[PDB]
């Protein structure tokens, strides 16, 4: 994703980031990045064990997940780098443990993260859950981080509101796009010149890199080799994503046998557990009709206790 972005925000617009508890997300439908997710678990039954447990925990708290996969990758920086020199096996093994649990899945036309955003900005889902801030660049209004973390790592989920980011940085999405690029995009080389905080300011009085370049020009702040500061700015805008309305995700009921006869058996693993597991997943289904108060009352804000003096 984007480099040093989280810190930049945290350091200049903390109002757009909140540290909520996994429970507060009850009733929310979220778009996840299966790819990265599947990866997270690895870093070989893990690609599914975590794909199992975690999705159970995400269910147990009322969160309705929709895993997403990538299609035909586009022109990513380090991506086509070895090409300057010239599998889905454990991947689809997951696209199975899912429908066998009654959990949706979608084949993104390219980059899922972009697709996830695509959804989020269509009311089809609440937030997008990845570890890469990219989603924000792609225009996604809400991004949730850590929603796939281990039950152990007691880390709360980190929410990000694009419309609050844009708010503080006083700049449109596009204007925000350029910032991400000069911050360190994984699509094209940034500019050795500008710094995290520095890169912001420039964009603030130069609504584009195209205008930022022609300004500072000495051999003291040179612009990259084959700088596609353009091609990229485009992707972050109009990516390749399956239409939101194209489909309606529906969480089905988990099939205990068919699945447990394709897990503890075909992939060998403690039966007692994956049984109580499928059991729990099936339970969480109960409150899959229970709406949120959000669904009816606008959120007023936050009452904060008065700062306590010192040991008086």
């Amino acid at each position: 994703g984007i480099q040093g972005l989280a810190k930049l925000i945290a350091d200049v617009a903390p109002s757009a980031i909140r540290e909520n508890d996994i429970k507060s997300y009850f009733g929310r439908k979220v778009a996840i990045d299966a790819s990265m997710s599947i990866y997270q678990f690895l870093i070989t039954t893990s690609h599914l064990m975590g794909m199992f447990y975690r999705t159970i925990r995400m269910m147990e708290n009322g969160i309705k997940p929709v895993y997403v996969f990538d299609g035909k990758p586009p022109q990513l920086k380090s991506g086509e780098l070895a090409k300057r020199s010239e599998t889905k096996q454990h991947n689809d093994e997951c696209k199975h443990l899912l429908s066998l649990m009654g959990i949706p899945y979608l084949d993104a036309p390219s980059e899922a993260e972009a697709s996830c955003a695509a959804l989020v900005k269509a009311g089809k889902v609440y937030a997008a859950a990845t570890e890469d801030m990219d989603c924000l660049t792609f225009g996604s209004p809400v991004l949730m981080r850590h929603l796939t973390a281990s039950e152990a790592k007691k880390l709360p989920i980190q929410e990000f509101h694009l419309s609050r980011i844009l708010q503080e940085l006083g700049l449109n999405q596009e204007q925000f796009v350029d910032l991400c690029i000069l911050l360190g995009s994984d699509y094209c080389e940034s500019i050795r010149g500008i710094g995290p905080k520095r890169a912001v300011d420039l964009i603030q009085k130069h609504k584009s890199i195209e205008e930022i370049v022609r300004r500072l020009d000495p051999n003291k702040y040179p612009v990259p080799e084959n700088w596609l500061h353009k091609e990229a700015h485009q992707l972050f805008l109009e990516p390749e994503v399956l239409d939101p309305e194209s489909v309606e995700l529906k969480w089905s009921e988990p099939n205990e046998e068919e699945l447990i006869k394709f897990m503890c058996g075909e992939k060998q693993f403690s039966e007692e557990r994956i049984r109580s597991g499928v059991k729990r997943l099936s339970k969480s289904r109960q409150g899959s009709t229970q709406g949120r108060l959000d669904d009816f009352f606008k959120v007023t804000g936050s009452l904060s206790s008065a700062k306590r003096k010192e040991p008086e």
């Binding site: 429970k23 229970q290 108060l293 009816f296 009352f297 606008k298 959120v299 904060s304």
Partner: protein, 258 residues
């Protein structure tokens, strides 16, 4: 600054008992108005709306507004030391880090006072717009308690079916199902403090008994509860506190999606 003397101390005791079990901690918004408090359950499917008009206190005095962060449970514990008939008296300093409670037995032979630690806390608020509802059922608060409890043993989801005739609570579960049905005993005046319904249109919403059974913890606060309902909108279970306030619980419906 802040100092409220409330003759009917039982109110605090009773309140903190109703709250402590549905939410573990919260912020008390103190002002010249009175004492107010809002917070939702960790799931955000419901919330408590406590209101104590300063008109009800024997003596009130809040020059500068306050927002006390309070571990409810701790209050519950300290208030359990207050005599059901004592005069509870809250007090707080400007940039207070603790809360002063002073229990006064009327018999003037006993007086307690505890200093409770406060805490830092941020509480997501919600704006409940003033709105009129389709159905409004006033009924024995203890009756509504038994109902929610009993059906909570049949199923964990109840269907409230209000009409001009009467209300019909229904639930269904593993062992079967059951339906309690209260009617408007227009039978002149005989019998119990029966049920009465004011209603524009018949409603029928489903709710999580798990939650209602938390609300009913506020029963000792009013001899009658009132459920306000309107189609596809959250339920309102309200317990009137004396004539100085009230305690409202809000609960999200069951989106019978299709």
């Amino acid at each position: 600054m802040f100092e409220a003397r409330l003759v009917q101390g039982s109110i605090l005791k009773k309140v903190l008992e109703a709250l402590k079990d549905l939410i573990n901690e919260a912020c008390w918004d103190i002002s010249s108005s009175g004492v107010n408090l809002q917070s939702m359950d960790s799931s955000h499917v419901s919330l408590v709306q406590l209101t104590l008009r300063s008109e009800g206190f024997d003596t009130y005095r809040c020059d500068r507004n306050l927002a006390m962060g309070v571990n409810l449970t701790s209050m519950s514990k300290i208030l359990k030391c207050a005599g059901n008939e004592d005069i509870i008296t809250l007090r707080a300093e400007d940039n207070a880090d603790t809360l002063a409670l002073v229990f006064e037995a009327p018999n003037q032979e006993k007086v307690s006072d505890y200093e409770m630690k406060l805490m830092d806390l941020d509480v997501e608020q919600l704006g409940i717009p003033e709105q009129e509802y389709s159905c409004v059922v006033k009924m024995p608060s203890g009756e509504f308690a038994r109902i929610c409890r009993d059906l909570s043993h049949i199923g964990d989801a109840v269907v409230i079916s209000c009409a001009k005739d009467g209300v019909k609570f229904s639930a269904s579960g593993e062992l079967g199902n059951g339906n309690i049905k209260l009617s408007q005993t227009s039978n002149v005046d005989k019998e119990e403090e029966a049920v009465t319904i004011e209603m524009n249109e018949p409603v029928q919403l489903t709710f999580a008994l798990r939650y209602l059974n938390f609300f009913t913890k506020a029963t000792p606060l009013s001899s009658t509860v009132t459920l306000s309902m309107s189609a596809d909108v959250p339920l309102v279970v309200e317990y009137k506190i004396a004539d100085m306030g009230h305690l409202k619980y809000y609960l999200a419906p069951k989106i019978e999606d299709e």
